[PDB]
Design a protein around this ligand. Structure first.
Ligand SMILES: OC[C@H]1O[C@@H](O)[C@H](O)[C@@H](O)[C@@H]1O
Length: 470
């Protein structure tokens, strides 16, 4: 029974936590010496692409209110906090020659020491989509292999400044989403793919450079820092459970494995065997870049742990100029005979399917033999409703059930043999949700946008504190 799940159902070294990313919570977008990221430019030049026309200039002001966030985290009682560094805050011009911003280094040091003073372990992600505009404008950012060397200079600065206290690093978070919505759909920054963009080629280049940036930073960590600092490094991937529309149709079973291949396998195979998956080579063909053997040798095994982010699931079937989307040759279905795979959250794409996380975890251990996994993101958004007062708004029983069910399933997956070392809910605070602006709330902590981003715990935060304190 999922309602009685609690810390005592887990081993002693199991880590519970919560998460954010820099651009979604910080604001201070032009404070403290920070330069612009591609998100700054996208939300300012193209406000029509954002619900409400809003941006993250102020967001929820964790740049100034970080002492409050630390205080909330202390009261919450969980082991860990996962956040990311804004690249253009510490390197406003992206590369070392653009100046090193000491004030942005001071921010991250104050945040890290306040977390440590309170017994909270920092898990830090280097990159969460906020490419410095200078690097975008100079040579097209992740479209160019120049990005690998710049990204390494940046990773080295972080290890040097923070590596004495941060022992858990992630190079990238959800690079899938960056690649696809940035370059295939054009819904996210830099907003291309519908030169002006090409959804047939650009996503594949971007992903290819993301993986090389990741591998070069891991080798840098491993050869130059790991012995003096004794930390660990990994990466976090987007996942969505892919279920055969018809359990029996072997054509359907194959469409599902291919959907997995194009989402997860696209990233996971290169760091496992040095190459892209077979299905992708077959359906993408000559548009899919190749690794030199030095690159392959660098990629293979380039991690100490992997993190997975899981929200939802879907049914897959077979499909009947070029585009990443059409290359998959699958169609997505939500119902089996008028019965949805699960109920909607406040977002129509997000269907609640807890068994999804147990399956995605077992699949990953099986298909890739990952020794050590964390669930680095999992969570759900409130029904949109500006008519509720805070007493009502904070009663977030859907989220509370969602968390219980998934955490339960995570337990199950460990009984199935998956070695899962921790779980981070997503996210700590209501914050800026990219295309969806401020309208979609994912936080265990409520934010009052009418009154200086005043923070208040929802029921789920109370529950997490009570069942998982330590
Ligand atoms: O808005 C949906 C997205 O929101 C962000 O908060 C997270 O970074 C993503 O993982 C999530 O898919």
């Amino acid at each position: 029974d999922a309602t009685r799940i609690s810390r005592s159902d887990f081993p002693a070294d199991f880590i519970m936590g919560t998460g954010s990313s820099a651009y979604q919570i910080e604001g201070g977008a032009r404070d403290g010496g920070r330069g612009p990221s591609i998100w700054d430019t996208f939300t300012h030049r193209r406000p029509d692409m954002i619900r409400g026309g809003t941006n993250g200039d102020v967001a929820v002001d964790s740049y100034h209110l970080y002492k409050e966030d630390v205080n909330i985290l202390k009261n919450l009682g969980l082991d860990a906090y996962r956040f990311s560094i804004s690249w253009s805050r510490v390197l406003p011009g992206g590369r070392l020659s653009g100046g090193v911003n000491k004030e942005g280094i001071n921010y991250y040091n104050n945040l890290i020491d306040g977390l440590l003073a309170n017994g909270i372990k920092p898990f830090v992600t280097l990159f969460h989509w906020d490419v410095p505009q200078a690097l975008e404008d100079e040579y097209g950012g992740f479209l160019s292999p120049r990005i690998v060397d710049d990204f390494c200079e940046y990773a080295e600065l972080c290890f040097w400044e923070f590596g004495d206290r941060v022992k858990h690093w992630m190079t990238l978070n959800q690079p899938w989403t960056f690649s696809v919505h940035g370059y295939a759909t054009g819904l996210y920054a830099p907003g291309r793919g519908r030169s002006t963009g090409n959804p047939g080629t650009e996503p594949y280049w971007v992903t290819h450079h993301l993986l090389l940036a990741h591998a070069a930073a891991v080798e840098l960590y491993k050869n130059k820092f790991q012995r003096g600092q004794e930390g660990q490094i990994g990466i976090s991937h987007a996942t969505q459970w892919m279920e055969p529309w018809d359990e029996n149709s072997a054509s359907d079973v194959e469409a599902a494995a291919r959907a997995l291949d194009f989402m997860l396998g696209w990233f996971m195979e290169p760091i496992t065997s040095g190459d892209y998956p077979k299905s992708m080579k077959k359906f993408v063909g000559s548009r899919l870049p190749k690794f030199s053997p030095e690159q392959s040798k660098m990629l293979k095994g380039s991690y100490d742990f992997v993190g997975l982010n899981y929200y939802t699931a879907s049914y897959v079937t077979n499909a009947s100029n070029f585009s990443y989307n059409t290359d998959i040759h699958v169609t997505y279905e939500t119902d089996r005979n008028g019965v949805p795979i699960g109920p909607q959250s406040g977002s129509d794409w997000l269907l609640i399917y807890p068994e999804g996380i147990r399956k995605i975890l077992v699949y990953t251990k099986k298909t890739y033999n990952v020794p050590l996994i964390y669930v680095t993101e999992n969570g759900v958004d409130d029904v949109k409703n500006t008519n509720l007062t805070l007493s009502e708004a904070r009663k977030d029983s859907m989220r509370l059930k969602y968390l219980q069910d998934h955490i339960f399933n995570v337990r199950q997956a460990m009984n199935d043999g998956v070695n899962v070392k921790g779980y981070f809910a997503w996210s700590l605070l209501d914050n800026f949700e990219w295309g969806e602006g401020y309208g979609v709330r994912f936080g265990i902590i409520h934010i009052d946008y009418n009154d200086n981003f005043a923070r208040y715990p929802k029921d789920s935060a109370v529950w997490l504190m009570n069942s998982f304190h330590k």
